[PDB]
Amino acid sequence: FSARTVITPDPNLSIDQVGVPRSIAANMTFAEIVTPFNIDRLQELVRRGNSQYPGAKYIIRDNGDRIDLLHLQTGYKVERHMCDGDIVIFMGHRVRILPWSTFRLNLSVTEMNLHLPQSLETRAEIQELAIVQDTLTAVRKFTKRDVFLERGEVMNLLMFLSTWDGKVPQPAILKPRPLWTGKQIFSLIIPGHINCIRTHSTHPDDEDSGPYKHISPGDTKVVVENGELIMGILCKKSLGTSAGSLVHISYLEMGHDITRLFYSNIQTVINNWLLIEGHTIGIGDSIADSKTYQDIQNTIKKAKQDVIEVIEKAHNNELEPTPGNTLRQTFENQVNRILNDARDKTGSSAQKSLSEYNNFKSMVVSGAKGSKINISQVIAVVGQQNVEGKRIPFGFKHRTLPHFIKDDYGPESRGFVENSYLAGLTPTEFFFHAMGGREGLIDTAVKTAETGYIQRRLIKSMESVMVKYDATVRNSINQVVQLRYGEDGLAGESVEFQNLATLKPSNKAFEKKFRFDYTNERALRRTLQEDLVKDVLSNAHIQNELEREFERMREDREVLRVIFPTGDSKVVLPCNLLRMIWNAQKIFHINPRLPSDLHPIKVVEGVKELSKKLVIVNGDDPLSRQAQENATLLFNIHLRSTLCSRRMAEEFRLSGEAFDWLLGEIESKFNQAIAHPGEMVGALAAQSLGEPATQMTKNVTLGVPRLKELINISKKPKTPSLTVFLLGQSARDAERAKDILCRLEHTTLRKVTANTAIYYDPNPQSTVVAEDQEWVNVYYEMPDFDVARISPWLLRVELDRKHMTDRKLTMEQIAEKINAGFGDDLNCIFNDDNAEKLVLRIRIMNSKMDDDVFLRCIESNMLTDMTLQGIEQISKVYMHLPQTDNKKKIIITEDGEFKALQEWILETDGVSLMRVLSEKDVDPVRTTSNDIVEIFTVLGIEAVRKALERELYHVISFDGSYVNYRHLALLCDTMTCRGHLMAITR
Amino acid sequence: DDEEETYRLWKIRKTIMQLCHDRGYLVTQDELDQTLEEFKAQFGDKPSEGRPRRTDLTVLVAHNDDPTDQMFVFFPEEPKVGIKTIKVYCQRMQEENITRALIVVQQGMTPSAKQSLVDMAPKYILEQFLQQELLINITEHELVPEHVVMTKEEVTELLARYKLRENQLPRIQAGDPVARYFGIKRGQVVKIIRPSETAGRYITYRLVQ
Amino acid sequence: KRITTPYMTKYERARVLGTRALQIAMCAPVMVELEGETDPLLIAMKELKARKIPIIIRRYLPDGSYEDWGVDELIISD
Amino acid sequence: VRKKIEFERKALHIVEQLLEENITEEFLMECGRFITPAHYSDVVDERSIVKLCGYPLCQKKLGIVPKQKYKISTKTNKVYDITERKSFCSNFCYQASKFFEAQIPKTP
Ligand SMILES: [Zn+2]
């Protein structure tokens, strides 16, 4: 239908505009019907003809006849060559005609075809429904305090502001010469009245703790007030799309329609300023001073010496290996850790070397997403080259390359590149880096295909999931997936990250900050006017209402404590109350140094009717009221904690008019945040959960295979783990934890035995084994069994003392296990426990093919079937302290603080949860596993849904990617609402 | 061996009493938190030589709304329960005029025994419980949210309010561990309350199928 | 009994503007006073904020019961 | 559909019928065609539960269970799992039972 052409960037175009060549524009036409108030222009176009570009091609009458290019009247559908202002799709874009023959777009969000619709309805609906690391560096350089612009430069930059009011601001410096600042220009760029706080990347943590915490010694944390950059350098996090950035806040406040204008103004002004200031990269940016180069060389030499010392000590191999790994794995891990930490230290030193003028630092401090490692490789060291998560394998016979010696584990071999890219790579280093790059190319090639398949499968899974008009989420077959979207029936693009401010603080701190002590009559005068102070002090109903509302807020805090363990104050709420309070303060020019005229009871009442006005489930029917309370519980608690009288009169210090405006704004924003019915919630959730799969590049499966088996219902996970917690004293001391471990880990006769041999005894009293003679004489006297019934053959097994001691196994347990397994006719005798070289003997009680091969087969079917201890499903158990707080027990102290206790926990490869839960002294509340099928078969459908969403959140957040909880909840409820676990449609 | 079986029986009895309390039966609070010493003193500290022999451990409870329910909980002596002892238990239920009983088995029953037990459902409601499944309360797990059985009139008014049908509502299998724990049969609805990081806590409903 | 959010969804806005633009492009009578600008989309939106669009929206409940809503009483945040 | 329920109803009725007491050969022969081998194995299970052999022909009560598996015979020099033999009072009953399941029809 159309002509495809490569895309060429064009900064001068609008973000929503596309540059289309005139030839391609005239190739295909848009059909328009004649209107009484457009007949003249259509007549002009049809008079121009098909020879010229801005003409028409075909005319269709009311009868459907087609005429090629003459009278035009009502009802005639004429197709004319597309012109400026038209809408095309590849998301819809506005068409602009440009001379040359390439499609043109702006690159600000991240050969292709285009299509323009013919009917007006689809055009209208696409119109109503539809800064990449390039300008970040120049924005960072533009917001420097050093930037001073002359009058002509200021005027030239000002002309490129589409939203400019035309009033030239007074320069930051008037004398000796009128000099503006880049901060002033960007302040003019910023639209509306946006207030934002965002720390810079360079901003160290000690600035806030010490003095100068907001006079910004090193151009610290960015502050923007009243929609204009007060202070700071705008890096990626302060400008790129993120949580609470300038662009994000401006969008959420007053519309993408002018956030696009913000983008365009930033791009144009920054490009025009960089036209005269200029940016470049060259040799001098990688020639860091000889001091830092010498330091890097010294650190690399020290690392190589440490690796050599490790190798020579490993040759002497005293070097007790770490538990849970063999010698090879442990020492490879040690060498890899040494090389990696040396590389990281050299890279950090190289990055710190660039003081102010290096052009690489400009990209590093701003675009630190994935450029830090490249810069470190360029300047300091390329680093160790790895293949399949390991160093370079011995492709030859115990030798990586023929230029080395056999069995060479030094840093020079195995793929460690000492030299950086500037110094050039040695041929061996060059080949090792070629191997690493080939592995990376293979990984990317497979990862793109797998991610595409996962995205297609996920979008096909829930393409029909939609939010219905009753604020319920239902599928195509009309089963209610969720009563309210995201468990609150509210949209996911209108929410923000906030803090409860009442969950973390201790009881003493909570009452110090949330009680409004009116028995002071001195601080009230400072914070409130005289009339309000007198009214509060005199009236007792005021005090009673205050006490009751802080009491209900305290019980709300307790409800939060129950709902939110681990003290995770970071929450997702639709209305950013702190930002709204700041906006109210700025709009009304609230002076925090004067007493407020806002009555605390007015605050409480306003909060009460505001909460009454925030409705998600309609109706006074009692279960509807309960559903409304469920939907708005978290928001009401957050509002009460934030908009409390003490906070409002102590730190916010708002006025009555400001408070009323704040209430109105909160109500309006919450109403706008509600998820409107009919939204394609399923597709949005699928794409949101599938986009991180692009960057998804004790052994546990994780990443792409983990997600694949999670979306599937495969009964055989690659590494099925099962986390085990303990109750009390066992969780503290390691000995009792080991005792719990030994009875959970499977133990055959292989793991305990050391050697096995069948002897022939001409007489049990003879006892050809000399060491066992005295014990044999002691045992066979007064026999419990029949001596005449013993077989001449004997099976003597010497056990492993260390293995027996580790698992707390004893001889009598083994003997009784043998007796239970085979019966009385397997007479077994066990020497002793404390006796040196412990051993035990087995004979056969008489009751065809061969007598000795019979014992051979008995041992073969005995050595791996006795099951001395543990569960046969549990392959192995590892014991450790959880460093992260996710697996660490967290409780609430008597004072109310959240305290994390370090307790021993177990990770078992091999999954059997029912037996472990039934086991004594194993925590029956927190013990779980990553096998969703096992959880469903043991716990239930709701429990498996919760475990599945926890596992999906873990696999998503391992690499730092964040997915809104609404999408994950929708995905989990989609394939758990059937009553049983279901796989994806695929 | 001996004390291990005592602890196992104590855990089984505690979980059974918790299940009965969750089912709305009159369960005394002091007997809910029965310790090891209390269990040993009341019944016996050594199941060997048959002093506690799964007899006199049978639990008798009465529903709070209807005192005449008097649901039985049985612990058969034999490791595997048979059809004959099932008929004996049914005759006992008849001669105390009681239609609800649970059975705590060790290694289950035959599928034919299961079919025979479930066939005569209307006269007497019998359910089978494994030794391992009752060794711990599943509802106490952090993954398992709060489940409550809601009345038929509650289901009707819920459907009238939300304007839903039985099929449109999500359902939970009758063989689900929680469904068997609460003794809910096909056609009933269970209300699930679960903590939610976006709304504090959320309420959903699951049909039994 | 008419229970539904008083706002108008983005999809509803898209379809109603599309239908109104198509009608006025087929020379349907216009109830708002006209300007010199010609584009039917622009006159559609300006009659939208004029709050006199002669189309009501039927909202289908999941069971199948309709729920009519006059566009006059559908307040618009944007 | 097509009156399936009567089939397993009759099968289960036969199940408790064999559990009652001694069964004549003709009744067992005529009822074996309408029951799956799983049904007869279940019948053996309940009959062993009540201390009977599991073979309906004999009615003598089984003695003390050995409560141990993997019996080894030096005369035959082989290891046999006797988790099923514990059900049957005598070995002959066990062989007769297994010969009986050898030819039970698998038709539903
Ligand atoms: Zn017999």
TrEMBL record, chain A:
Coiled coil: none annotated. GO terms for molecular function: core promoter sequence-specific DNA binding; DNA-directed RNA polymerase activity; hydrolase activity; metal ion binding; RNA-directed RNA polymerase activity. GO terms for biological process: mRNA transcription by RNA polymerase II. Its main location: nucleus. Its EC number is 2.7.7.6. Its cofactor is Mg(2+). It is found in: Chromosome; Cytoplasm; Nucleus. GO terms for cellular component: cytoplasm; euchromatin; RNA polymerase II, core complex. It catalyses: RNA(n) + a ribonucleoside 5'-triphosphate = RNA(n+1) + diphosphate; a 3'-end ribonucleotidyl-ribonucleotide-RNA + H2O = a 3'-end ribonucleotide-RNA + a ribonucleoside 5'-phosphate + H(+). Keywords: Acetylation, Chromosome, Cytoplasm, DNA-binding, DNA-directed RNA polymerase, Hydrolase, Isopeptide bond, Magnesium, Metal-binding, Methylation, Nucleotidyltransferase, Nucleus, Phosphoprotein, Repeat, Transcription, Transferase, Ubl conjugation, Zinc. The keyword Zinc applies. Belongs to the RNA polymerase beta' chain family. RNA-dependent RNA polymerase that catalyzes the extension of a non-coding RNA (ncRNA) at the 3'-end using the four ribonucleoside triphosphates as substrates. An internal ncRNA sequence near the 3'-end serves as a template in a single-round Pol II-mediated RNA polymerization reaction. May decrease the stability of ncRNAs that repress Pol II-mediated gene transcription. This is DNA-directed RNA polymerase subunit. It comes from Sus scrofa (Pig). The lineage of its organism: Eukaryota, Metazoa, Chordata, Craniata, Vertebrata.
TrEMBL record, chain B:
Its main location: nucleus. GO terms for biological process: transcription by RNA polymerase II; transcription elongation by RNA polymerase I; tRNA transcription by RNA polymerase III. It is found in: Nucleus. InterPro entries: Arch_Rpo5/euc_Rpb5, RNA_pol_Rpb5_N, RNA_pol_Rpb5_N_sf, RNA_pol_subH/Rpb5_C, RNA_pol_subH/Rpb5_CS, RPB5-like_sf. Pfam families: RNA_pol_Rpb5_C (PF01191), RNA_pol_Rpb5_N (PF03871). Residues 136-208 form the RNA polymerase subunit H/Rpb5 C-terminal domain. It comes from the Eukaryota. PROSITE patterns: RNA_POL_H_23KD. Residues 3-93 form the RNA polymerase Rpb5 N-terminal domain. Coiled coil: none annotated. The keyword DNA-binding does not apply. Keywords: DNA-directed RNA polymerase, Nucleus, Transcription. GO terms for cellular component: RNA polymerase I complex; RNA polymerase II, core complex; RNA polymerase III complex. GO terms for molecular function: DNA binding; DNA-directed RNA polymerase activity. Belongs to the archaeal Rpo5/eukaryotic RPB5 RNA polymerase subunit family. This is DNA-directed RNA polymerases I, II, and III subunit RPABC1. It comes from Sus scrofa.
UniProtKB/TrEMBL annotation, chain C:
GO terms for molecular function: DNA binding; DNA-directed RNA polymerase activity. It comes from the Eukaryota. Its main location: nucleus. GO terms for biological process: transcription by RNA polymerase I; transcription by RNA polymerase II; tRNA transcription by RNA polymerase III. It is found in: Nucleus. One of its GO terms (cellular component) is RNA polymerase I complex. The keyword Transcription applies. Keywords: DNA-directed RNA polymerase, Nucleus, Transcription. The keyword Nucleus applies. DNA-dependent RNA polymerase catalyzes the transcription of DNA into RNA using the four ribonucleoside triphosphates as substrates. Common component of RNA polymerases I, II, and III which synthesize ribosomal RNA precursors, mRNA precursors and many functional non-coding RNAs, and small RNAs, such as 5S rRNA and tRNAs, respectively. Pol II is the central component of the basal RNA polymerase II transcription machinery. Pols are composed of mobile elements that move relative to each other. Belongs to the archaeal Rpo6/eukaryotic RPB6 RNA polymerase subunit family. This is DNA-directed RNA polymerases I, II, and III subunit RPABC2. It comes from Sus scrofa.
